[PDB]
Amino acid sequence: YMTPMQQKLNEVYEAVKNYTDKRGRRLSAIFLRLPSRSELPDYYLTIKKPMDMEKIRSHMMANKYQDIDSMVEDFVMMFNNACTYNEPESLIYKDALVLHKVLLETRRDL
Ligand SMILES: CCCc1n[nH]c2oc(=O)c3ccccc3c12
Numbered sequence: 001y002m003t004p005m006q007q008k009l010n011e012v013y014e015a016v017k018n019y020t021d022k023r024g025r026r027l028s029a030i031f032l033r034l035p036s037r038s039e040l041p042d043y044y045l046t047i048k049k050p051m052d053m054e055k056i057r058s059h060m061m062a063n064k065y066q067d068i069d070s071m072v073e074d075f076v077m078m079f080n081n082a083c084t085y086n087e088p089e090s091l092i093y094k095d096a097l098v099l100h101k102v103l104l105e106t107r108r109d110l
Contacts (some may be wrong), residue, residue: 005067005068006063008110009068011058012054012056012075013056013060015105015106016053016099016103021098027100030095031082031099032052033053033054046058046084047081047085049081050088051074051077055074056074066098068107070106072103074100075100076100078096081097
């Protein structure tokens with residue numbers, strides 16, 4: 001049922017989604033869906049282009065993304081957003097760094 005390109009897209013998305021650390025913590029959990037403008041106003045003041053994994057998953061599932069590196073660039077913007085808005089001392093910031101590494105390892109393989 002999946003084409004090669006769909007399959008590659010899915011593999012990159014699932015690698016980031018399913019990653020768990022050695023304690024069983026799923027780092028992606030908080031990245032799935034951005035809170036509202038009233039819930040996280042300071043993020044929307046700080047970030048020009050909001051992104052979350054549900055937005056990427058929808059784009060993937062409408063068979064948009066013409067190539068793998070488009071999806072990589074949307075994940076990279078998401079993690080760059082997280083690290084612009086949050087302080088380096090925060091857990092989400094550290095989590096964004098780890099998932100960014102996981103994303104690139106997957107891409108390096110294809
Ligand atoms: C509850 C805080 C959620 C949050 N804080 N900072 C964030 O930066 C992000 O880039 C991001 C992306 C997708 C979902 C949530 C957040 C986020």
